[PDB]
């Protein structure tokens, strides 16, 4: 059982800048025939893994010259020169020199870029959900960098987190921005005892918050 060990576990780098992923193996990956069966797979958000490199250094047809693999015995590296935006994903090294075939646990290649403000959109519940006795209020933070952000809810001026759920998209492959939604789920009854609904976002790359609000009596 060959433990394959990758570092770093997460790698952020800026467009055009190069990145280096290391893969170290418990044992030597030189087969008794001298061939070295060490491959690289990239898995992009929401897809299968696809081969990039097989046997240390051979690019699968389709793969650009930016990518290259190197090393021997137990020590292997993959290099990405003009990191493009489409290159983000999870890079896995795999060995099939020894049975069982094994994978490293992967390395997340994040993109780095200039900070960016959310466009904030807030959504009252739908009459459909209301009819069923529920009321989810949604606040959507679109196209922002970095990943970290707190959103909080205020009902008639006063804070709420019970029944709040937050959730991020994967980093966008074109703009390298993130989005996220926060969802405050009440009962229709509790929703209808209050007028004002407000979501407030902060992140630590602003000393101010961004606010978006609606009033029920204004529907």
């Amino acid at each position: 059982d060959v433990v394959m060990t990758q570092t770093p576990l997460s790698l952020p780098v800026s467009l055009g800048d190069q990145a280096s992923i290391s893969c170290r193996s418990s044992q030597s990956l030189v087969h008794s025939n001298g061939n070295t069966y060490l491959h690289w797979y990239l898995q992009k958000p929401g897809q299968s893994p696809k081969l990039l490199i097989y046997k240390v250094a051979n690019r699968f047809s389709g793969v650009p010259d930016r990518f290259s693999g190197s090393g021997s015995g137990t020590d292997f590296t993959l290099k990405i020169s003009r990191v493009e935006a489409e290159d983000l994903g999870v890079y896995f090294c795999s060995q099939s020199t020894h049975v069982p075939w094994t994978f490293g646990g992967g390395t997340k290649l994040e993109i780095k870029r200039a900070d960016a403000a959310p466009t904030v959109s807030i959504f009252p519940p739908s009459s459909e959900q209301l009819t069923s006795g529920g009321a989810s209020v949604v606040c959507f933070l679109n196209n922002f960098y970095p990943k970290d952000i707190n959103v909080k809810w205020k009902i008639d001026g006063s804070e709420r987190q019970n029944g709040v759920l937050n959730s991020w998209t994967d980093q966008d492959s074109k703009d390298s921005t993130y989005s996220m939604s926060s969802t405050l789920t009440l009962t229709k009854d509790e929703y209808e005892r209050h007028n004002s609904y407000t979501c407030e976002a902060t992140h630590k790359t602003s000393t101010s918050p961004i606010v978006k609000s609606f009033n029920r009596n204004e529907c």
Partner: protein, 220 residues
């Protein structure tokens, strides 16, 4: 083009049995070693089954040996994985994979995968609710719309817009688990001119409950 399409996935009780299938096409199936490779929730990959081209020899890691059976029907271009005595550890996205034919011992093609969820919980279809502006000033250069998908199990769901035609600007957040049910939301932003000047629709798929749904995003 080569493709691999898996099915069989779903939810199953501890100690139960399931049979996954994989339809292969665009290559001479008969000439290629096949395999199943699974990806756990913690996102790690594990080879679980290998079968030779003629289906004469099989291999399994110690993890599943005795419990898993890989087979292939070379006549019907189909690969199978029979699973038994299911542990919770077996919960994973199961990929059907092809080996190269040059004995460089790599996987050259992977399907989209099917999901196995091993638990005592119940398969439950989603509800979809529109996300539509209101009760506030919504004006100007663009309009952001969406679908909120709640109360489903197991995962995953897929959301599309206009049967795939609307791909651009779409943001779909990861699903979140709460009191045994998943939820997510998908949103798209478009020009204020084009809505409600056309009817805008979201397409929600939950395979495990063999559910497909359409919601049209109306106003007011």
């Amino acid at each position: 083009d080569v493709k691999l399409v898996e099915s069989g996935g779903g939810l199953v009780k501890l100690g139960g049995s399931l049979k996954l299938s994989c339809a292969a096409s665009g290559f001479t199936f008969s000439n290629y070693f096949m395999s199943w490779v699974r990806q756990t929730p913690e996102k790690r990959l594990e080879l679980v089954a290998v079968i030779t081209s003629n289906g004469d020899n099989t291999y399994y890691p110690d993890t599943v040996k005795g419990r898993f059976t890989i087979s292939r029907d070379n006549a019907q271009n189909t690969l199978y994985l029979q699973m038994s005595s299911l542990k919770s550890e077996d919960t994973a996205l199961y990929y059907c994979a092809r080996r190269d034919s040059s004995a460089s011992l790599y996987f050259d093609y992977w399907g989209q995968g099917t999901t196995l969820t091993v638990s005592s919980a119940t398969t439950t279809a989603p509800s979809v609710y529109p996300l539509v502006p209101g009760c506030s000033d919504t004006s100007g250069s663009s309009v952001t719309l969406g679908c909120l998908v709640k109360g489903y199990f197991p995962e995953p769901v897929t959301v599309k817009w206009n049967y795939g035609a609307l791909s651009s600007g779409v943001r779909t957040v990861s699903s979140v688990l709460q009191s045994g049910f998943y939820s997510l939301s998908s949103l798209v932003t478009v020009p204020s001119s084009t809505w409600p000047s056309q009817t805008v629709i979201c397409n929600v798929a939950h395979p495990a409950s063999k559910t497909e749904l359409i919601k049209r995003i109306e106003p007011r």
